[PDB]
């Protein structure tokens, strides 16, 4: 059953990486009233917001992550949240961790002798999911500062998190099975 488990792990890792990359790249994260000129229904992602329908359909504008004026530096937590949202460091970190987990899976399939690599892969996947969670929260918090709705990029990210957790569990199970085989062989040889 090792081959089936490894195929499932590889397919899930690739799917989660592709979903997270598409979610970061695309701009259909949120549907809300706004303006794309520097009010009309618009779709906004992590980097740009574009007007759909209207006289300015298809025009995209970079999102200003530091709204308001007078530069009220009364709270540092708000500035930290704005900087974290503007950088989008957590979704990108999740993408990087998914890529590293896939690379570790490939390296394990290549060497076929170092078990710890498998474990590392699993950690990455789990870590990626955790990062994903933080990003989601940050994004929603950034929307705190009219009915709105979430596009398919948000749910692509959520599905990426779920698949990353599943792949991490599968990788940990594979690691445990490899150590089971090692213990059985050691018992047989001793």
């Amino acid at each position: 059953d090792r081959g089936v488990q490894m195929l499932l792990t590889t397919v899930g890792a690739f799917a989660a990486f592709s979903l997270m990359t598409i979610a970061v790249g695309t701009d259909y994260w949120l549907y809300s009233r706004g303006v794309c000129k520097t009010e009309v229904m618009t779709h906004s992602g992590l980097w740009r917001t574009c007007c759909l329908e209207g006289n300015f359909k298809g025009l995209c504008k970079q999102i200003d992550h530091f709204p308001e004026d007078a530069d009220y530096e009364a709270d540092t937590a708000e500035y930290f949240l704005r900087a974290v949202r503007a950088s989008s460091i957590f979704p990108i970190l999740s993408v990087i961790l998914l890529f590293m987990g896939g690379l570790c899976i490939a390296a394990s399939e290549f060497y076929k002798t170092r078990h710890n690599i498998i474990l590392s892969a699993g950690i990455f996947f789990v870590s990626a999911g955790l990062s994903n969670i933080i990003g989601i929260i940050v994004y929603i918090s950034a929307n705190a500062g009219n009915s709105y709705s979430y596009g398919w990029s948000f749910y692509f990210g959520a599905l990426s998190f779920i698949i990353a957790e599943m792949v991490g569990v599968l990788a940990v199970h594979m690691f445990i099975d490899r150590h089971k085989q090692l213990r059985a062989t050691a018992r047989a040889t001793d």
Binding site: I123, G129, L130, I133, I136, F161, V169, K180, R183
Partner: protein, 156 residues
């Protein structure tokens, strides 16, 4: 217009939808991390059996029991497992205290688009309970049917 009674799923009203989704994600992540820190180490194993009983299914069951304020027959014993359990317990305390503070008010809110709670205000939880009972009965019957077919195939 006419007053709008709360929906069949009004028990989710006290928290926003994003909070519920984040709770589901946090539950999944906590269960996965608990299982990983409880079972990954080969030095926690002994043909060979783990020192702890925290598999993925048992981790999910423990997390659900902790969030439901019920508990189970198992509890983490390692340092990292206990860290996960304690942080999950703190999260559960905060979230459940926030959710149950004004549940009845959300259950009996009237909108345009004191009194005892009525059965109409809590019909959804009864429907969900009966549906869960039926689903469990169906799952048990399916497993029984499968095992009986496998045993019959082995016999002949």
């Amino acid at each position: 217009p006419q007053k709008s009674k709360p929906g069949v799923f009004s028990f989710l009203d006290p928290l926003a939808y994003e909070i519920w989704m984040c709770i589901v994600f946090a539950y999944i992540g906590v269960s996965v991390v608990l299982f990983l820190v409880s079972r990954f180490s080969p030095y926690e194993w002994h043909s060979s059996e783990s020192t702890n009983e925290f598999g993925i299914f048992n981790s999910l069951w423990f997390s659900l029991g902790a969030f439901m304020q019920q508990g189970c027959d198992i509890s983490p014993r390692s340092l990292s497992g206990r860290i996960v359990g304690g942080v999950w317990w703190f999260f559960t305390l905060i979230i459940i205290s926030s959710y149950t503070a004004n549940l009845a008010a959300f259950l009996t809110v009237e909108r345009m688009v004191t009194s005892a709670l009525s059965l109409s205000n809590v019909a959804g939880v009864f429907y969900i309970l009966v549906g869960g009972l039926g689903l469990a009965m169906l799952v048990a019957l399916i497993e029984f049917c499968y095992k009986s077919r496998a045993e019959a195939k082995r016999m002949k």
